[PDB]
Design a protein around this nucleic acid. Sequence first.
RNA 1: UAAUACGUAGGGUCCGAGCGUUGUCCGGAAUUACUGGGCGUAAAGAGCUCGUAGGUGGUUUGUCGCGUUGUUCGUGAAAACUCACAGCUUAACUGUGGGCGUGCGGGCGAUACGGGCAGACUAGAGUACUGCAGGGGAGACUGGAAUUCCUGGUGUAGCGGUGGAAUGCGCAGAUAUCAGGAGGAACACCGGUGGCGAAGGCGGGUCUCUGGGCAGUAACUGACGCUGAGGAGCGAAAGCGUGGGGAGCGAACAGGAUUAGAUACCCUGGUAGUCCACGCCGUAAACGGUGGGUACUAGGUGUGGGUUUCCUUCCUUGGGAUCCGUGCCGUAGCUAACGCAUUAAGUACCCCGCCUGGGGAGUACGGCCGCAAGGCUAAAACUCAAAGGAAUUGACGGGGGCCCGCACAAGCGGCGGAGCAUGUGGAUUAAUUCGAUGCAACGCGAAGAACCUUACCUGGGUUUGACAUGCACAGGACGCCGGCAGAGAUGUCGGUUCCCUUGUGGCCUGUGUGCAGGUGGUGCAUGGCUGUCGUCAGCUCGUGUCGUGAGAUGUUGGGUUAAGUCCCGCAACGAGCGCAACCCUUGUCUCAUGUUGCCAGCACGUUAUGGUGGGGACUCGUGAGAGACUGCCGGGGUCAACUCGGAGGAAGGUGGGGAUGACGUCAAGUCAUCAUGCCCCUUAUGUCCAGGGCUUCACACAUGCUACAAUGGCCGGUACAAAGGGCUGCGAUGCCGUGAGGUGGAGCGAAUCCUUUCAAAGCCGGUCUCAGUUCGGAUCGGGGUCUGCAACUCGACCCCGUGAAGUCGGAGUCGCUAGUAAUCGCAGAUCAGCAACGCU
Lengths: 208, 114
Amino acid sequence: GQKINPHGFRLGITTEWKSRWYADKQYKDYVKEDVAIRKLLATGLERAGIADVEIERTRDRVRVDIHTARPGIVIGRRGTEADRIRADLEKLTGKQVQLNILEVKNPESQAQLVAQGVAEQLSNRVAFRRAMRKAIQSAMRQPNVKGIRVQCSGRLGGAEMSRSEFYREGRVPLHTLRADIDYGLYEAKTTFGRIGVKVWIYKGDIVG
Amino acid sequence: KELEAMEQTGGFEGRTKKEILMLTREKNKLERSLGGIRDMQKVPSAVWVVDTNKEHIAVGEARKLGIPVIAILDTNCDPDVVDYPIPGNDDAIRSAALLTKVIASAVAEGLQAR
RNA sequence: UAAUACGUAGGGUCCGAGCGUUGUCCGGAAUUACUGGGCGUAAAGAGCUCGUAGGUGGUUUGUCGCGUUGUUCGUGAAAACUCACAGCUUAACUGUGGGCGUGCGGGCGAUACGGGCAGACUAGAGUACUGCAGGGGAGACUGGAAUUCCUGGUGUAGCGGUGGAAUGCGCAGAUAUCAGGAGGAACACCGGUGGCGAAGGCGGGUCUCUGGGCAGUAACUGACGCUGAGGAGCGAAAGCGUGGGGAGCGAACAGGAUUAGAUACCCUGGUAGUCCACGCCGUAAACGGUGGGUACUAGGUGUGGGUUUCCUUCCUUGGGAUCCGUGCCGUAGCUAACGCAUUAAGUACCCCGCCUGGGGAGUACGGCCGCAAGGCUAAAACUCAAAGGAAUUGACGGGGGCCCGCACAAGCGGCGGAGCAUGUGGAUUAAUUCGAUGCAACGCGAAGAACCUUACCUGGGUUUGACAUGCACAGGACGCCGGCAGAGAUGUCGGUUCCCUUGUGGCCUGUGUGCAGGUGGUGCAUGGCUGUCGUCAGCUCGUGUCGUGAGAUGUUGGGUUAAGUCCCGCAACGAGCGCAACCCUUGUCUCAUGUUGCCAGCACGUUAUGGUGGGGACUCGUGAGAGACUGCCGGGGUCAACUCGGAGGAAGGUGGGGAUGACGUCAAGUCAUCAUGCCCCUUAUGUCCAGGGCUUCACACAUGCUACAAUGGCCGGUACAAAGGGCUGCGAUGCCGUGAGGUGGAGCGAAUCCUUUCAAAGCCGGUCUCAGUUCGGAUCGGGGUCUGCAACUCGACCCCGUGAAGUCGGAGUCGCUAGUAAUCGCAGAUCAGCAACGCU
């Protein structure tokens, strides 16, 4: 409890809900539906990384949305994997799945995608130095990355130690309430054990 | 450039009034500090040095390259290492009026004979 | 138990007929430093001087050729070493011919340099003459104050001692006071980065005897000089010997006192000794921790001594210039750096001392000296892998300066005292499941342990399983509804015996194969999450300048602040993560907004009442914006901030409380919320089952409440809050029960309805009249209710009788600065019902 999530703290104001609906008796039901949904999704497809997963419910319609910069890996090209997705979602019984798949605009200012890519790089066989450094470079050369902080931790490089060393650049005032912040916490496999990664991306302010 | 163009653009009370006080402070401090790199751009030419006794600490900053350091000498300082002294008198207003127009003369005629 | 450092596997490097180990010697090792080192602090300058042997030596003329230097002969056996060859199938090996064979004896040539010889010179050196100081020493004699003590006077009951007291001195006449007298050490102010001396060291005064030093002339002699192994002499205080003397001080010693004990610091007394004479020893932080001597090598600066021209009155820190001696600042230069820097730790030669890792040890043995104490020279075995010097960051400090926090002070209520309500410790135990451990745990993981949970124990079944999936082989039905054996697990009859469409499948029956699972271990393998110092004001980076480097600077110094918030002058300029602030709630107002709630202005019901139409006017519930911004006043203030009292306001000087955890430590905690690297179970530490436990208690620790009463106990009567909860549920009125409770269901997914039109303190009337009590309620024996299939370990609740401890709490501690504390009650997440008096 050293630093709570900026997404979870600005949720009331600046960042927005990932599952919009209204329910009174069906609330418990919809949440257990939702978690079984997202779990079967991640258990099915893991090779290209999900950027966001959003859900909405209506009288009878159900609108599940999935952001990922690499659609062709994720989706059925002919319709194979997307129909497989509708199959799983009909077992779980959303009953009207208007599956609007989307690719994001900036894969390097999408916090979760960047952390997942670096995590994959680590998990394969690689060190963390060049990955972290190039991540900073790749993010910061683009327009909107005003400040970043990339925080890698684990038995880094096999050093049998609980370590924590990070590389940042720019401006990351998490206390600037009005400003949009994007957070990503992603844990990656490794031969030795599990590594954690966190990333904060600052973005301008918001006036309104 | 950013600061000056902000106060030129004229957007003030869309932010805090005390912040306008502080921006004027910023330009006041940056004006007692900064005249010439507004125009420099030219990897400067290392020449006219002042007040060796009081600020001996400038010996390390300027000479490092040995491209001439140049002044009217100080009466009793660490003298002859650096390339170009000029004897003279340090104190008096009148003497300074004279040297001031003398530099005005030499600089203007050097400009003209460019 | 997870090793690239152990043994073995494969593999690879190195070498090869050898490969590794051992033993010694050289090198590396500038680690005995002639080539080629050092002594301020790292090991190292004798305690300081005189001086023998010795080493070293100013200028010049002339001379010898001893050194030295040049060539030639003689010589340096041969073999060796190396160059050029020849040959042994080349090479190894052999021979030929050279160079060296590093030095030696004779002659010859040179004389600059060293030396010897014969001189000379005057800069060094000493002397001479005249001045100049000065606690320089030794002896003789002598002075005043002051302390104690003996005589006497006044005189009274304490005096002395400390942080505080008592031993002690007095009460036989103290201390205090005053005159006189006795006495023997040390000399206040002068007196100090201040003079003298080789050094130790030297100051009351006068005399006498003596010594060195500085300056001026530089008349005089003419290199006589410098150093110095040994040696001799001198040498603080303490100690030794003989004699005298002894006021004060004072080790030892004695007593009081603090103390865990104080052989110590404190106090009261006090012996030697300190004092003089004459003989000793010969040590010290005998320290400028820098051996002596001579010269060159920027200055500025006080201050002491003697000469002397200039302004000269010519009386003067006058000023200038020279000589000597002394302290501070400062370049070059040097140094590991610290720091020295004309009084050198730099610049070069002369002489000497001295060092070669620490410890053992400056010790032992032997010797010299010593009356003794003991000093000097001075090792080894053996052992350690470092001992050490200088500076930096951090922390720490019973060192300091400046500051804030209910940190203490102030004022209140508690703990510790009794009762029980729960959470732990220890011990019982067949089982009392595990973890959490001062601050930061103990009403913790729990937000509800009877079975369930539950992980633990007795007993029973299970073993590819309580639930899946990948394979194929044998399946077409599989379940479900009732029956029997059964604590239940579990096995067994009666009824269900499919839809695909010929290829197979939903499905489940088995067989095993992949297995599937763990609350089994490592939280010091990890991630994630979280508390903590600490919501304390800081913690870092860029590029630079400084430093050989660790690192510094910025971020130091003033004003100033809730704070690294801000201003001013500076090797720093700039910035970020922080502190502030846009978030929520509350605090005020303008407009709208009209029910499921208000209801002033109006008309209608009247037993319960806004209850119904009617007004959205005040309230108002929900939203948007202005309002605090030192906003303006004038006196203070680097005129900057920073404040001081104002108006106006609903609020005013970060309105208040909230949310928010800079980098990281405590290897903080959780492998049992979860995730997971590695190790283990598998016929079982898995797993299905009923019973029991986690609530055992001769005790301890902690958290709280209920009490020890008249501000209180009891009956009755009267009015108001906020606030939320609700459907296979909240439950109203009526009536019956003592009362928990009850058929029953009005109305209700709910500003309405259950939620008495929502309460308890409090108010009014009266009794109890200060006591184990109408306080207090434990504790038990019985009469009973609800839910749950089931109230014994083990549930809450009413009623009857029950009536215990407790008469204001110990050393210390805990929480609190305003709508706070103390008190009354309500509501609820979890939850069927509960220990919930907890938590919110």
